[PDB]
């Protein structure tokens, strides 16, 4: 069907008024729109994209680290096995590091070489893609990060309506900006965002990017394809074969992102991207306060546990911060958070009572203001409140955190561990009891 090649939801902006118009925010966060392309966004806000040009970046922090992916330059929208015999999902994406200065040299020489060639199945050429460049440090990137505060609030890296702001600590590349330096064919293979959070991406130019998008509710189909092909959906590099998707009745949105266009990837939307020209991009995540965002983040948090993959977003910590600090006025979102908090509380009460009944001391440890969430040093599951720390790490005050299961596996009666408690039961109960639905007429 042509239902399988649907039009891209698109907003055409001319000025600041259009950027700040509330129906824009509502359109982006509507779960029926898997992606929204906001055309002309940089022009409409007079955003200086020159602050993100390769020349500017080299002048600012020439030795800054760049993760390099070395990839094959594949034709059009296809991915061929290295022999050029058949189309397959697995893609070659070998990893190394470089600096902004060194990648910039390659990006520029790549272009000059193409000019020279223009003045003249595979085998394919190799290219390098500069990815995951960390723009978190405000003392290194002051002017760059300041420019992004010109965005409307809903798309900012930091805002009161962004769940990632309510985490209360840094999650690199999610509530901090990542930069991408590209040459033609540079590919970001198929993925959903970490914990299914929305993503914001602005193309710096001067070249274009081509995007491929599949709605969230088809992700199981793509997971199945990965498994049938010996690939890990979450952890492997794959580039979908569009003919497979079409055969499976999976709709694919496909579009070009020009310099100054902002791409809003909605919660859980599956996507893969390739540079058509030479360009840089910037991106980060946002978490709208909607039932849909929270539900999908929780779902992926739980799926990640089943797949033994770390969740970058500590959904337990976050849920407590929401209850402590956010007046929630949507009944559906409210009931979800409340439901999660009750599960957390009851599991905590069950575990704490079992420890005490076995005669294990629970040590009052408290918490430093703004301390990040903890994850198990062995299995990387989030660990909330009750921390299992070895007698030796306790003595040394390194406080190396384990979950209960990992501690028990090591030490059958927890004889090798102390149990540290960061929050009093009565204090968590009060937060839960006082978390009630606020009235909004909106
Ligand atoms: O620009 C890229 O290659 C990264 C795109 C992406 O995955 C995102 O913005 O979420
Ligand atoms: Fe992405
Ligand atoms: Zn563990």
Mutate which of 192, 199, 203 for ligand 1 pocket (most atoms within 8 A of beta carbon): 199
**CA–CA gap between residue 181 and residue 67 (Å, rounded):** 10
DSSP letter (8 states) at residue 136? -
DSSP letter (8 states) at residue 333? H
For tokens 């296809």, the residue is 78
- For the CA of 283, the nearest atom of ligand 1: 9
* Span from the CA of 189 to the centroid of ligand 2 (angstroms): 9
User: How many other CB atoms sit within 10 Å of the CB of residue 1?
Assistant: 8
3-state class of 41 per DSSP? helix
**H-helix or E-strand spanning residue 256:** strand 253-257
What resolution in angstroms, rounded to 1 decimal?
1.8
Order the strands of the 187-191 sheet from edge to edge: 187-191, 270-275, 209-214, 253-257
Dihedral, CA atoms, 370, 375, 381, 384, nearest 10 degrees? -50
Could you tell me the sign of the dihedral formed by the alpha carbons of 367, 372, 373, 379, in that order? Answer: negative
* Ligand 1 contact, 188 CB (< 6 A): yes
Q: Are strands 253-257 and 382-383 parallel, antiparallel or unpaired?
A: unpaired
**CA–CA gap between residue 128 and residue 66 (Å, rounded):** 11
* Ligand 1 contact, 269 CB (< 6 A): no
b/e code 304-330 from CB counts within 10 Å (16+ = b): beeeeeebbbbbbbbbbbbbeebebeb
- Number of alpha carbons in the 13 Å side-chain half-sphere of residue 327: 3
Atom 3 in ligand 1: which residue has the minimum CA distance?
188
**CA–CA gap between residue 80 and residue 87 (Å, rounded):** 4
For residue 400, the ligand closest to its alpha carbon is 3
**CA–CA gap between residue 251 and residue 4 (Å, rounded):** 4
* Ligand 1 contact, 203 CB (< 6 A): no
Residue 220 CA, distance from chain mean position: 19
- For the CA of 273, the nearest atom of ligand 1: 3
Q: Is the distance from CB of 75 to CB of 139 less than 8 angstroms? A: no
* Span from the CA of 330 to the centroid of ligand 2 (angstroms): 28
* Ligand 1 contact, 144 CB (< 6 A): no
Residue 422 CA, distance from chain mean position: 28
**H-helix or E-strand spanning residue 318:** helix 315-325
Q: Mind giving me the DSSP string for 407-424?
A: HHHHSTTSTTEEEEESS-
3-state class of 148 per DSSP? helix
For the purposes of burial, counting CB atoms within 10 Å of the CB of 25, is it exposed (0-12), middle (13-18) or buried (19 or more)? Answer: middle
Chain interruptions in the chain, by residue before each (C–N > 2.5 Å): 120
> In the structure encoding, which two tokens stand for residue 158, read together?
């930091």
Q: Which CATH class is domain 1-290?
A: mainly beta
3-state class of 16 per DSSP? helix
All structural domains of the chain with their residue ranges: 1-290, 291-357+425-442, 358-424
What are the backbone dihedrals phi and psi of residue 138, each rounded to the nearest 5 degrees, phi first?
-65, -20
Mutate which of 174, 188, 237 for ligand 1 pocket (most atoms within 8 A of beta carbon): 188
User: How many other CB atoms sit within 10 Å of the CB of residue 72?
Assistant: 18
Q: Name the method of structure determination.
A: X-ray
Q: Does domain 358-424 have CATH number 3.30.530.20?
A: no
- Provide the β-strand partners of residue 386: 421
What are the backbone dihedrals phi and psi of residue 26, each rounded to the nearest 5 degrees, phi first?
-70, -35
* Ligand 1 contact, 44 CB (< 6 A): no
Q: Does domain 291-357+425-442 have CATH number 1.10.1200.10?
A: no
**CA–CA gap between residue 375 and residue 308 (Å, rounded):** 13
Order the strands of the 178-182 sheet from edge to edge: 10-12, 35-39, 262-265, 198-206, 279-286, 178-182, 126-134, 65-72, 93-99
**CA–CA gap between residue 268 and residue 6 (Å, rounded):** 18
**CA–CA gap between residue 221 and residue 250 (Å, rounded):** 8
**CA–CA gap between residue 291 and residue 105 (Å, rounded):** 46
**CA–CA gap between residue 420 and residue 399 (Å, rounded):** 9
**CA–CA gap between residue 288 and residue 294 (Å, rounded):** 8
| 379 labelled ligand-binding | yes
Q: Is the distance from CB of 4 to CB of 249 less than 8 angstroms? A: yes
Atom 1 in ligand 1: which residue has the minimum CA distance?
281
DSSP letter (8 states) at residue 85? S
3-state class of 96 per DSSP? strand
Q: Mind giving me the DSSP string for 370-438?
A: TPPPEE-TTT--EE-SEEEEEHHHHHHT----B-HHHHHHHSTTSTTEEEEESS-HHHHHHHHHT--PP
Contacts of 160 (CB under 8 A, 6+ apart): 153
Q: Is the distance from CB of 1 to CB of 27 less than 8 angstroms? A: no
Atom 9 in ligand 1: which residue has the minimum CA distance?
201
* Span from the CA of 188 to the centroid of ligand 1 (angstroms): 6
> In the structure encoding, which two tokens stand for residue 224, read together?
């199945």
CA distances from 2 to 6, 215, 217, 246, 306 (A): 7, 16, 18, 10, 36
> In the structure encoding, which two tokens stand for residue 21, read together?
């118009």
Please choose, from the candidates 70, 124, 93, the residue with its C-alpha nearest in 3D space to the C-alpha of residue 239: 93
DSSP letter (8 states) at residue 159? -
* Span from the CA of 262 to the centroid of ligand 1 (angstroms): 11
| 209 labelled ligand-binding | no
**H-helix or E-strand spanning residue 351:** helix 331-357
* Ligand 1 contact, 180 CB (< 6 A): yes
**CA–CA gap between residue 386 and residue 354 (Å, rounded):** 12
């Amino acid at each position: 069907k042509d239902k399988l090649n649907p039009p891209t939801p698109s907003i055409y902006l001319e000025n600041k008024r259009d950027a700040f118009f509330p129906p824009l925010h509502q359109f982006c966060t509507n779960p029926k729109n898997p992606v929204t392309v906001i055309r002309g966004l940089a022009g409409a806000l007079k955003l200086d994209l020159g602050l993100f040009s390769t020349k500017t970046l080299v002048e600012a922090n020439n030795e800054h680290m760049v993760e390099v992916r070395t990839q094959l330059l594949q034709p059009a929208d296809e991915n061929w096995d290295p022999t050029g015999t058949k189309k397959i999902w697995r893609c070659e994406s070998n990893r190394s590091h470089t600096t902004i200065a060194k990648y910039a040299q390659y990006q520029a020489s790549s272009f000059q070489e193409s000019l020279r060639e223009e003045n003249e199945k595979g085998p394919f050429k190799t290219i390098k893609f500069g990815t995951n460049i960390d723009l978190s440090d405000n003392k290194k990137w002051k002017l760059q990060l300041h420019e992004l505060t010109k965005l409307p609030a809903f798309a900012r890296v930091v805002s009161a309506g962004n769940l990632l702001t309510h985490v209360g600590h840094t999650i690199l590349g999610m509530n901090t900006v990542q930069l991408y330096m590209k040459v033609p064919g540079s590919r970001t293979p198929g993925h959903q965002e970490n914990n299914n959070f929305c993503s914001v991406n602005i193309n710096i130019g001067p070249g274009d990017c081509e995007w491929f998008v599949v709605p969230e509710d088809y992700w199981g189909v793509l997971n199945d394809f990965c498994e049938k092909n010996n690939l890990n959906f979450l952890m492997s590099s794959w580039w979908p074969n569009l003919e497979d998707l079409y055969e499976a009745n999976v709709p694919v949105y496909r579009f070009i992102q020009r310099p100054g266009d902002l791409v809003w990837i909605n919660a859980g939307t599956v996507h893969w991207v390739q540079a058509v020209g030479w360009c840089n991009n910037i991106a980060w995540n946002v978490g709208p306060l909607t039932a849909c965002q929270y539900k999908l983040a929780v779902e992926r948090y739980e799926w990640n546990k089943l797949k033994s993959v770390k969740s970058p977003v500590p959904m337990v910590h976050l849920s407590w911060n929401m209850a402590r600090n956010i007046k929630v006025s949507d009944p559906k979102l409210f009931e979800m958070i409340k439901y999660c908090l009750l599960k957390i509380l009851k599991q905590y009460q069950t575990l704490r009572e079992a420890l005490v009944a076995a005669g294990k001391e629970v040590i009052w440890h408290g918490r430093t203001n703004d301390e990040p969430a903890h994850y198990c040093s062995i299995c990387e599951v989030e660990v909330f409140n009750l921390l299992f720390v070895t007698n030796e790490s306790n003595t040394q005050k390194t406080y190396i955190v384990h979950c209960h299961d990992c501690a028990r596996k090591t030490s059958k009666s927890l004889e090798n561990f102390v149990v540290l408690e960061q929050y009093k039961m009565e204090d968590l109960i009060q937060v839960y009891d006082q978390f009630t639905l606020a009235l909004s007429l909106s």
